[PDB]
Amino acid sequence: GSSGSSGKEALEALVPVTIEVEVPFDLHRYVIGQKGSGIRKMMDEFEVNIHVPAPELQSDIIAITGLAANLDRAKAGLLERVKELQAEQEDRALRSFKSGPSSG
């Protein structure tokens, strides 16, 4: 029960642009890495610039600078990375073997 396909876009520019991506600060620490390598792989691959909000800000909106074209491919990688990351780190938390009604 799945079909359809469309994605037209007409934009030409030289200077990049900053966007906004929804991501939990609880994952940032995991996204950035011990120092900041994990992300380095992207900025080098997608050829973009990712900036994470400081802890004193408590912001869950990551800013990504780059060409609308790069922002798309990049933004697509993170979004999926977050859904796949939480699904795991959370999975182990979901199965809370304890008293109470639990579906199967």
Side-chain angles (χ1 to χ4, degrees):
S2 282
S3 192
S5 193
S6 184
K8 288 74 165 205
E9 55 184 74
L11 171 155
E12 172 166 89
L14 36 156
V15 177
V17 282
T18 299
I19 57 170
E20 271 184 321
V21 193
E22 289 151 76
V23 177
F25 186 88
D26 275 324
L27 292 175
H28 293 178
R29 62 174 159 187
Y30 301 135
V31 181
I32 308 153
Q34 78 181 87
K35 208 90 191 204
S37 49
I39 291 184
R40 201 89 183 290
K41 175 198 88 179
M42 313 164 83
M43 290 201 283
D44 272 31
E45 179 84 301
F46 295 99
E47 304 155 314
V48 277
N49 171 41
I50 297 166
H51 270 199
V52 177
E56 55 152 332
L57 298 167
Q58 294 186 292
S59 205
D60 30 88
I61 322 290
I62 286 171
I64 313 176
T65 307
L67 290 173
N70 319 4
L71 309 162
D72 270 61
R73 47 175 73 275
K75 184 185 181 151
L78 209 64
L79 290 163
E80 282 206 298
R81 209 88 179 83
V82 181
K83 305 162 70 155
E84 271 279 325
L85 277 161
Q86 67 183 245
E88 302 272 329
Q89 60 151 21
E90 200 80 30
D91 157 56
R92 57 186 282 188
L94 196 159
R95 35 162 88 181
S96 274
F97 70 101
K98 285 200 76 197
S99 69
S102 69
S103 286

